[PDB]
Design a protein around this nucleic acid. Structure first.
Length: 276
DNA sequence: TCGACGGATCC
DNA sequence: GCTGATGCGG
DNA sequence: GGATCCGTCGAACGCATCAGC
């Protein structure tokens, strides 16, 4: 079925106005995304922080348009060590962070440009492009090792400051999180291994799935659709892009959105409103 | 994702 | 720059 | 033996690299 995201709630559970708007977008090709007008949409969304995944663009090749952003002038990027048109993330912020770091501090998992950590006054923001398990599940063994190192890293982070994690986590947690769960139980993104790890991630850190916390029974809300088979026109998709929050931020949570109608990738953007 | 393939298994 | 083939992705 | 179940098998879309020139 087709999905309509409800209007933005911009007041917190205590009536306080949202002060921080974070948008996250797996652009799947930063340069093509910009050519497909992605930055225009960004300028109208006007986030305070913009997190990008699957940029597929080395630092040298960053399009000129990106410095034309004066509302997101503090920009951080991470590309793979050696694979050239692969993976990649970026973090653009209105205000300068206190401290920015790349990767999770584990050599094996910090070579594919997947993680940026940005520390702000009252929280830490992580954006991540989690490794796909791969066609025929060839990288599933590696993915399970990623899941554990990433969980352990995030647990340490969240022990020192409240944590926001966003981006393409490359799993649909539960059957409500994709249109065809039955046919996908042996495909990347919906293996029991990947689903288990996501559950362990929520419990171990701990983290809450912002969108599920507010809309725990809302079906057909997805963030990705294959380019093939006209999937997006039929809303045959997966919810792969999340905002995961420390529990102590839940009273700061105003809304967690899915921007279904913004085009330019095979993912749509998602947006978090917090009252900090 | 989808429909074409098998190879069982059924009124 | 242009073709044609390969890597990758849920 | 002619339908109807199943689990496989394959090739689409899009971006970006690579090889070669």
């Amino acid at each position: 079925a087709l999905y309509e995201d409800p209007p933005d709630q911009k007041t917190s559970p205590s009536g306080k106005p949202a002060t921080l708007k974070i948008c996250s977008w797996n652009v799947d090709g930063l340069r093509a995304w910009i050519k497909k007008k992605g930055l225009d949409w960004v300028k109208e969304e006007a986030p305070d922080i913009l997190c990008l995944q699957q940029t597929k663009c080395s630092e040298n090749k960053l399009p000129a348009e990106l410095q034309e952003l004066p509302g997101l002038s503090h920009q951080y990027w991470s590309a793979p060590s050696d694979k050239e048109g692969y993976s990649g993330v970026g973090l653009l912020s209105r205000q300068a962070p206190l401290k920015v770091s790349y990767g999770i501090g584990d050599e094996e998992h910090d070579q594919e440009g997947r993680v940026i950590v940005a520390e702000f006054d009252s929280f830490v923001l992580v954006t991540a492009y989690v490794p796909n398990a791969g066609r025929g599940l060839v990288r599933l063994e590696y993915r399970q090792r990623w899941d554990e190192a990433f969980r352990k890293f995030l647990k340490g982070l969240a022990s020192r400051k409240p944590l926001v994690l966003c981006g393409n986590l490359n799993v649909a947690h539960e059957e409500i999180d994709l249109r065809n769960p039955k046919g996908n139980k042996k495909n990347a993104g919906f293996t029991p291994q990947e689903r288990q790890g996501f559950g362990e991630l929520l419990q171990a850190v701990p983290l809450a799935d912002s969108f599920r916390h507010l809309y725990p029974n809302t079906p057909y809300a997805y963030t990705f659709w294959t380019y093939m088979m006209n999937a997006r026109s039929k809303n045959v998709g997966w919810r792969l892009d999340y905002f995961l929050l420390s529990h102590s931020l839940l009273p700061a949570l105003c809304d967690s959105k899915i921007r279904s109608k913004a085009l330019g990738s095979d993912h749509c953007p998602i947006t978090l409103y917090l009252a900090l």
